[PDB]
Amino acid sequence: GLEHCVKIIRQLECSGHIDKNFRQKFLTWYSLRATSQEIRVVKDFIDTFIDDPMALAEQLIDTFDDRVS
Amino acid sequence: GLEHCVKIIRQLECSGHIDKNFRQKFLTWYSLRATSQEIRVVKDFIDTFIDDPMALAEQLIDTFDDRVS
């Protein structure tokens, strides 16, 4: 769950769909703060936007940018 | 796990991406306090930012500086 999330989130950053700031904020939040239920949301989004990294990035931002800041 | 983490953390210090203080604080925290789950986060970050030591350093600081101080 963690391994996979980190890899994808780096991939998005490297591909330019998320900025460095959000990646850093997000990984911190996911690693420590994010609750069991909140991890299930993230896992679920990742699986839904497989071939659509742009839509995934936009979704993670829309859902979690407030919580991670 | 420990051996590898220590080597990387020293490498970052010696390369100037982390200061001496944080290295010392971090090794203490990792050696003694850090929980099973917290070690998995560290291991995972290290593996993600191999070729980007600046980003690794910035990530470890963002995630762990509070816990190690």
Residue numbers in the entry:
A (entry chain A), B (entry chain B): 621 to 689
Paper text:
The Arabidopsis VEL proteins are accessory proteins that interact with PRC2 to nucleate and propagate silencing at the FLOWERING LOCUS C (FLC) locus, enabling early flowering in spring. Here, we report that VEL proteins contain a domain related to an atypical four-helix bundle that engages in spontaneous concentration-dependent head-to-tail polymerization to assemble dynamic biomolecular condensates. The VEL domain adopts a compact globular fold, consisting of four α-helices in a quasi-antiparallel “up-down-up-down” configuration, each of which contributes to the hydrophobic core, as illustrated by VEL1VEL. Mutations blocking polymerization of this VEL domain prevent Polycomb silencing at FLC.
Noting that most crystal structures of SAM and DIX domains were determined with polymerization-defective mutants, we switched to this approach and thus succeeded in obtaining diffracting crystals of different mutants (including I664D, I575D, and RR>AD) under diverse conditions. We conclude that the VEL head and tail surfaces are defined largely by three key residues, an isoleucine (VIN3I575 or VEL1I664) and two basic residues (VIN3R554,R556 or VEL1R643,K645), that engage in close hydrophobic or electrostatic interactions, respectively, with partner residues from the apposing complementary surface. Indeed, VEL1VEL I664D crystals contain right-handed helical filaments composed of 12 protomers per turn that interact through their head and tail surfaces. Three of these filaments intertwine into a superhelical fiber whose width (∼79 Å) is similar to that of the WT VEL1VEL fibers observed by EM, suggesting correspondence between the superhelical fibers observed by these two methods. The same is true for VEL1 filaments, whereas the VIN3 filaments in the crystals are composed of dimeric VIN3VEL subunits. Clearly, VIN3VEL, but not VEL1VEL, has an intrinsic propensity to undergo domain swapping while forming assemblies during crystallization.
